[PDB]
């Protein structure tokens, strides 16, 4: 079946605080975890985009 979408502590608290969408954020970490470095360089991108 599904494990449903994971989202570890680090990342769920920064993308709380960053105020970005985990589950767009599709996790790759153990178990479909979204991990911090998945938020961090998601999150950063969407900034990062200026045109």
């Given at each position: 079946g599904?494990?449903?979408v994971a989202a570890m502590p680090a990342a769920?608290?920064?993308?709380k605080?960053?105020?970005i969408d985990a589950s767009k954020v599709?996790?790759?970490g153990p178990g479909?975890?979204?991990t911090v470095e998945d938020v961090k360089?998601?999150?950063e991108?969407?900034?990062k985009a200026t045109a």
């Open positions: 599904s494990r449903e769920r608290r920064l993308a605080e960053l105020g599709k996790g790759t479909g975890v979204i360089r998601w999150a991108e969407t900034a």
